[PDB]
Structure 1
Amino acid sequence: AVYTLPELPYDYSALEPYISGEIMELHHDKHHKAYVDGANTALDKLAEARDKADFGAINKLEKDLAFNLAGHVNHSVFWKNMAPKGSAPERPTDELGAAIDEFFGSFDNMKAQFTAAATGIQGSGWASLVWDPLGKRINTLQFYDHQNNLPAGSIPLLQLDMWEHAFYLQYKNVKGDYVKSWWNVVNWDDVALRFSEARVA
């Protein structure tokens, strides 16, 4: 197939007590898998459309593609953005740390802005730290669902899943507690790597 489900870079319960293994198992094995299958199906349908010269369902297929592919991209980044506490730095350093200070003033300011973007979402969505190739800077974006509210060319560096399936079983309606806990498992090494390769447009 074109798209494949990546394996988690750690055990399902490696993020505990911050994120339960039960959520990790359902989130990865069920939800992420659905997006991969959906993105592949969308491409197969578009190929069939071209062969028969029948683009009647083009509007449906383009949304199926955007929704599922965005879901695949977002989750793929999400898994790598995390690591068991202690396995990675608790704060950004070197170039990344300097860039964050440059575009947000300080790490604390970026954290506050990112947290506000995460908890204020009206519906399903993501809080995202991206590299803007046009402005050559790091911005925070608030995705709606998986594929809305973002400029083309945006390169994801750090993402936080704010869909209810990401925290409900453990934190219930208290999304604030989920966000606080999540900061403990952010893999700043992964974010630093993405930044190193992203700041080249």
Structure 2
Amino acid sequence: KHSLPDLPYDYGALEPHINAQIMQLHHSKHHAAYVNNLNVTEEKYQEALAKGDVTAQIALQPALKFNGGGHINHSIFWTNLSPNGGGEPKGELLEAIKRDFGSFDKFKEKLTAASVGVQGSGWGWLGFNKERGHLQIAACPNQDPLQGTTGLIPLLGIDVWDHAYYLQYKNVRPDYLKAIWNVINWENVTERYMAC
């Protein structure tokens, strides 16, 4: 059984960068739905698997990836943000960024370009490539999780689904990206990085 994780702060904690209304809808409505739908889908899949019903297993793939991915992506997202975030990262994460992207500002531009360039709904990802041993930026459509579809280990995710910024920034996705840098929890990104 999967559960909706509690937010590490108060819905209004990210203001004025991300207003309380968005945080509340995004977490208590959108994320909750994914978790609920995921549990329903997993139960159906278990039955199909027990019966060896391959057709049913393949028919359920879209619902599982969408809801399972929705749950995974958001759980990481909440930990990537903090009312005490912002600024730049330090330690070896910082040097990894300089080494792989040239500079922190260059990295920001790269991830911002990837995020803003998503057609429709999606996510912009900084991830870690275990095979090559370096940082890598990637964009994923809809709710397709980073690791499950690309193999990259997620470090920092940026949700560019409209439900993440439209109420406040409307059609100006770049304004949203500009504001989010102020609440990035770099200690969390560093932990995730040191883990892999």
TM-score by length of 1: 0.92
Residue equivalent to 2:68: 69
Equivalenced residue count is 195
Compute the displacement of 1:146 (Å).
1.3
Choose which of 106, 130, 133 in structure 2 pairs with 1:136. 133
Query: In structure 1, what is the Cα distance between the partners aligned to 2:70 and 2:7?
Result: 16
Residue equivalent to 1:193: 191
Residue type of the alignment partner of 1:8: L
Most deviating of 20-29 and 54-63: 54-63
Compute the displacement of 1:126 (Å).
0.5
Query: In structure 2, what is the Cα distance between the partners aligned to 1:55 and 1:64?
Result: 15
Compute the displacement of 1:89 (Å).
5.3
Query: In structure 2, what is the Cα distance between the partners aligned to 1:81 and 1:177?
Result: 19
SS for the counterpart of 1:4 is coil
Residue equivalent to 2:179: 181
What's the CA shift string for 1:60-89, capped at 9, x where partnerless?
A: 3122111111111110111110111xx235
What CA RMSD, in Å, does the superposition of the two structures yield over aligned residues? 1.5
Query: In structure 2, what is the Cα distance between the partners aligned to 1:108 and 1:53?
Result: 52
Residue type of the alignment partner of 2:31: H
What's the CA shift string for 1:17-42, capped at 9, x where partnerless?
A: 00000000000000001111122112
SS for the counterpart of 2:11 is coil
- What is the percent sequence identity of the aligned residues? 46
Residue equivalent to 2:5: 6
Compute the displacement of 1:196 (Å).
0.5
Asked whether the equivalents of residues 100 and 135 of structure 2 are also in contact (C-alpha less than 8 Å), the reply is yes
Query: In structure 2, what is the Cα distance between the partners aligned to 1:138 and 1:79?
Result: 21
Q: How does 1:19-58 map to 2 (within 5 A)?
A: 19-58=18-57
Residue type of the alignment partner of 1:172: K
Which consecutive unaligned segments of at least 5 residues does structure 1 have?
none
Is 1:160 the counterpart of 2:158? The answer is yes
Q: How does 1:80-99 map to 2 (within 5 A)?
A: 80-84=79-83, 87-88=84-85, 90-99=87-96
Which structure features the higher share of helix residues? 2
Asked whether the equivalents of residues 128 and 193 of structure 2 are also in contact (C-alpha less than 8 Å), the reply is yes
SS for the counterpart of 1:64 is helix
Asked whether the equivalents of residues 89 and 189 of structure 1 are also in contact (C-alpha less than 8 Å), the reply is no
Residue equivalent to 1:115: 112
TM-score by length of 2: 0.95
Query: In structure 1, what is the Cα distance between the partners aligned to 2:86 and 2:141?
Result: 29
Asked whether the equivalents of residues 125 and 146 of structure 2 are also in contact (C-alpha less than 8 Å), the reply is no
Most deviating of 115-124 and 51-60: 51-60
Residue type of the alignment partner of 1:9: P
SS for the counterpart of 1:5 is coil
